[PDB]
Amino acid sequence: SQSIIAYTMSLGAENSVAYSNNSIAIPTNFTISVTTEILPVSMTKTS
């Protein structure tokens, strides 16, 4: 009932910008969010 499936990669999703030379999009609200980043600093010291 299950199998290995081969498929091509997506690149995120398709989008576009209207680019009217007479128009600007301006935010009316915002969200403050917090994300995280993980960075190694040190190795186990050995001898």
Binding site: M9, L11, G12, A13, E14, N15, S16, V17, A18, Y19, S20, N21, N22, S23, I24, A25, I26, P27
Partner: protein, 147 residues
Amino acid sequence: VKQIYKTPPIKDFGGFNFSQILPDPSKPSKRSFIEDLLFNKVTLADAGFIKQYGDCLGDIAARDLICAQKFNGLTVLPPLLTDEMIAQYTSALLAGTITSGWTFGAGAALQIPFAMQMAYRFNGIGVTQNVLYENQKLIANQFNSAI
């Protein structure tokens, strides 16, 4: 960019050209004219990553250095992303920054006229926006010539 923006249908970026920067709509490849030149100028030793055994089955194996490497257990692996996929990412970046500029990222892409995008960049440099409007034709020509 996870939003692959299509090359805008509107080329009215003030007086600016950018056609040699943007992807060529007539080319199977998603490369721009300049990108196509970059690809043509860098020389790769080989392409396609497939050689069949029969293809080197003779004296020829000694002339084809890459095949000679394969016969000694040394191989070359393909990249995960293809040239076309990279061109699609650069296309999205160009579409994004040409039509929304700063605001194409850090959230939803928000459109803005090209001249205004540069006016804000000039204010950022420390040049009054009035310089761009006064010299808008000059600036577009200097850019178009530089490209």
